[PDB]
A paper describes a structure:
The coronavirus spike protein mediates viral entry by binding to its host receptor and then fusing viral and host membranes. A defined receptor-binding domain (RBD) in the spike protein is responsible for receptor recognition. The RBDs of SARS-CoV-2 and SARS-CoV-1 recognize the same receptor protein, angiotensin-converting enzyme 2 (ACE2). Biochemical data showed that raccoon dog ACE2 is an effective receptor for SARS-CoV-2 spike protein, though not as effective as human ACE2.
In line with our previous research, we used a versatile structural platform that combines a chimeric SARS-CoV-2 RBD (containing the core structure from SARS-CoV-1 and RBM from SARS-CoV-2) with a chimeric raccoon dog ACE2 (containing the core structure from human ACE2 and VBMs from raccoon dog ACE2). The complex of these two chimeric proteins crystallizes in the same way as the complex of SARS-CoV-1 RBD and human ACE2, yet it reveals the specific structural interactions between SARS-CoV-2 RBD and raccoon dog ACE2. As we have shown in previous research, the binding interactions between the RBDs (from SARS-CoV-2, SARS-CoV-1 or related coronaviruses) and human ACE2 are largely determined by three virus-binding hotspots at the RBD/ACE2 interface: “hotspot-31” centers around Lys31 in human ACE2, “hotspot-353” centers around Lys353 in human ACE2, and “hotspot-ridge” centers around a receptor-binding ridge in the SARS-CoV-2 RBM. Among these interactions, Asn487RBM forms a hydrogen bond with Gln24VBM from human ACE2, but not with Leu24VBM from raccoon dog ACE2. Thr82VBM from raccoon dog ACE2, however, weakens this hydrophobic interaction network at the hotspot-ridge, reducing ACE2’s binding affinity with SARS-CoV-2 RBD. In raccoon dog ACE2, Arg353VBM and Glu38VBM have longer side chains than Lys353VBM and Asp38VBM from human ACE2, respectively. Hence they form a very strong salt bridge, which forces the side chain of Glu38VBM to take a twisted conformation.
Author numbering:
A (entry chain E): 335 to 527
B (entry chain A): 21 to 614
Write the structure that this text describes.
Amino acid sequence: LCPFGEVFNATKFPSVYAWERKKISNCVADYSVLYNSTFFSTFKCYGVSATKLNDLCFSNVYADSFVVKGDDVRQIAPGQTGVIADYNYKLPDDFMGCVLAWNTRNIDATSTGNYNYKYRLFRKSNLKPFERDISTEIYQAGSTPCNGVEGFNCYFPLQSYGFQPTNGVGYQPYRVVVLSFELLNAPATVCGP
Amino acid sequence: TEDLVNTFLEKFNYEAEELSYQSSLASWNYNTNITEENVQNMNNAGDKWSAFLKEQSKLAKTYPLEEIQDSTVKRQLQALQQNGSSVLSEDKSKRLNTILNTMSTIYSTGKVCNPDNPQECLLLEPGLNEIMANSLDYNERLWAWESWRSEVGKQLRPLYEEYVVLKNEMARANHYEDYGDYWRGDYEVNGVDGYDYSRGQLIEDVEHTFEEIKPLYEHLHAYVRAKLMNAYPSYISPIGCLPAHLLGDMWGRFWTNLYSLTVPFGQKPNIDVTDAMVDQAWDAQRIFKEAEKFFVSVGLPNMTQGFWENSMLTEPSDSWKVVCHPTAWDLGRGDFRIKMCTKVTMDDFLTAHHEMGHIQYDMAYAAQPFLLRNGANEGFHEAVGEIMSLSAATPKHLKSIGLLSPDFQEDNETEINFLLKQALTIVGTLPFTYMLEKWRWMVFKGEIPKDQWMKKWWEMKREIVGVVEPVPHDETYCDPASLFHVSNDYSFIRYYTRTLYQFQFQEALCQAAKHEGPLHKCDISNSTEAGQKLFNMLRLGKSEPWTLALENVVGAKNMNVRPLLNYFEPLFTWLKDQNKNSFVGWSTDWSPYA
Ligand SMILES: *[C@@H]1O[C@H](CO[C@@H]2O[C@@H](C)[C@@H](O)[C@@H](O)[C@@H]2O)[C@@H](O[C@@H]2O[C@H](CO)[C@@H](O[C@@H]3O[C@H](CO)[C@@H](O[C@@H]4O[C@H](CO)[C@@H](O)[C@H](O)[C@@H]4O)[C@H](O)[C@@H]3O)[C@H](O)[C@H]2NC(C)=O)[C@H](O)[C@H]1NC(C)=O
Ligand SMILES: *[C@@H]1O[C@H](CO)[C@@H](O[C@@H]2O[C@H](CO)[C@@H](O[C@@H]3O[C@H](CO)[C@@H](O)[C@H](O)[C@@H]3O)[C@H](O)[C@H]2NC(C)=O)[C@H](O)[C@H]1NC(C)=O
Ligand SMILES: *[C@@H]1O[C@H](CO)[C@@H](O[C@@H]2O[C@H](CO)[C@@H](O)[C@H](O)[C@H]2NC(C)=O)[C@H](O)[C@H]1NC(C)=O
Ligand SMILES: *[C@@H]1O[C@H](CO[C@@H]2O[C@@H](C)[C@@H](O)[C@@H](O)[C@@H]2O)[C@@H](O)[C@H](O)[C@H]1NC(C)=O
Ligand SMILES: *[C@@H]1O[C@H](CO)[C@@H](O)[C@H](O)[C@H]1NC(C)=O
Ligand SMILES: [Cl-]
Ligand SMILES: [Zn+2]
């Protein structure tokens, strides 16, 4: 009953800097579609067991979608300090969910080069857990002002991935879905039969 | 200010990934398809990546190098700053690039015609190289040798004169002594206490290590000369130098082709079972999968999927042009392939381990930042690849693979035959390499007047290499430019340094593998301990200085001749006994002419 296919089998996936969020509640979750599949290449559940979660009840599930290269997938975990985990998507140290990812070279990589997927390279401070930043203001690393124009020590914050089919596995596009589980004061709204 | 360089390099590292991978992908299509369509696309992407390095290097110099504390960060900015040699006139650099292109075209298109039959006009490869490597006629070899230096050699004389002037002007503007001091900077380590190295220390160490090679080379020279007197009777003196056109190639850079004339024990069969090993066809995938298992047994990773999907492992159809030089490609972004025109032979099977050694090096230092993805110095890559074919050529490995007969007879005579073949290639090129760079170093330093170029060139050939010109050459010739590396603007001392490095590596890896017998019989297969010691050097890249990366494997901060001399010690004692009734050394006054 839960719209899981609308998140996993979704056509367009967002950039990691502008990751999307879907709030799911009041349905019958069938997590067997996920862990009984060679489709997923990672599937690391932090805080819960990847198998025991099927007979467990929660309050709501937050499915976060984005795209990162293969070498950037290891940053989608509690306690990481890369570029994706610092300026794009930081998971909390007390994260209670599962991180699923799979290779999408045939879908997200073109021979001419897929430059659509972008990520934030520079930011003043780091990102608090589950924070989002869509600002395209010219990052200023030095003292001299940057106005709106680029130039000396004035850099555009967003950089774009280059997804060609000849890239190595570490540089191939992977679609990540971060299932975030939580329980408020009401603990039962979505559960497995 | 130290944080400013961090944000600057963090944009350089990611914008370089874009332009370097696009220029590398376009460069691959030309080498897999020679067509003006691809030649222009390759050059365009390369021009973008070049213009990028122009601006980024100027911007990199604006940041002070000494105001940085982080060693790894300081090393990154330095490489970018040192890449800025843009101190010349737009017109004079345009002429220098015209000179460099003219010499390259003359060398690659130079043709000589047989005076007896003008129908046969031969360029260098193939033709003149086939004469210098197979012909046993003194006059025929003398013709090809003299023609290449009297025709195309003289054309390069005026170009090389202006080539020196413009190159020295460019170098001196970058606080360099000369263009020779420029090339020598690849070994310079300014900073890190205890691991430094100067642009002049290389000259001292190269000459020091070469002094210990003189005894081994003198006896190889004496043995070769005696054998060559039987091949070319009445043309060679038992006490004089060897004529240049009798050395196996156009220049004498390698004595490999002299093995048929200098084989110690010719009655024993040759281990190059290429003919019968062709019958064991297997496939091209089996050849490289065997190379894969070699590195896997030592503890190194398997080849990437891109290697089996995007690489040239054979020769597809006929409607597709392909360049045949063996090359390993590290295009970036995890893209690793090898392009090499290989059949089901055996000499390429050794080169297959060589080129795959380059890939293992490229794979290991991929974790380093962009500016630090290179060998420790220019000689580190070739030394890494050479030890692979060095281990994969031993009879023990060939027995265990199923290629050689399980009951091969390893006499002490078949050991000399193999080592002698190695010495003609490995040791014969050391005096040629050092003497060539010694001449170019002194020319750039202004120590050789223009009216004494060929006089000093051949004075050093007779003294250092022990090779005399067959016919006298005045200052109209330019025999150095008759070699590819000289006329195409490439440093040449790398072939000397890597040759000493590769035996230091092999000695270190075989001691880590606890090899028992002689060093030339060592095979580091199945030795995870030897791979861990080697891997600790491959992963460094150009991050740590070359002295430290060398120390991580061999345990020394400089070159070492002892591993090279110990490799050829079974042959060295045999040569000393063979020359007891000969004359070791040569008179620098005897010449084939009068
Ligand atoms: C200024 O920099 C440019 C670009 O170098 C970049 O910056 C440095 C700091 C490093 O991070 C580099 O990785 C980066 O690209 C220099 O121009 C290029 O220089 C490289 C090498 O320095 C040339 O590429 C290769 O050069 C190899 C030298 O050994 C050649 O050897 C091959 O190795 C492969 C291994 O895969 C094997 O198949 C073989 O053994 C083979 O011998 C190889 O042929 C290849 O050419 C490249 O061609 C250069 N390109 C251009 C456009 O210049 C530049 O030299 C430098 N200038 C300075 C320092 O003055
Ligand atoms: C995304 O699309 C894939 C297909 O490309 C979906 O996979 C399919 O999922 C259904 C269940 O939703 C599977 O049906 C079940 O199959 C089992 C046998 O495995 C059968 O016993 C059940 O009765 C039921 O029919 C189906 O087999 C499976 N097929 C494939 C090819 O994967 C997936 O559910 C979609 N949604 C996601 C991934 O969220
Ligand atoms: C060590 O290397 C040798 C080859 O160099 C391996 O021995 C061969 O292994 C294959 C299959 O594993 C057999 O078909 C061959 O017959 C073996 N060679 C010989 C001569 O018998 C060996 O597996 C490697 N590892 C160890 C632990 O010895
Ligand atoms: C060579 O090119 C093949 C087809 O590519 C197209 O045709 C060639 C002639 C070029 O014009 C190229 O720019 C075109 O895109 C490829 O199928 C093949 O893999 C390439 N390499 C080899 C070794 O054949
Ligand atoms: C190499 O191949 C072996 C055998 O298939 C495999 O067990 C190992 O994981 C591979 N290593 C890689 C792909 O790095
Ligand atoms: Cl010469
Ligand atoms: Zn090589």
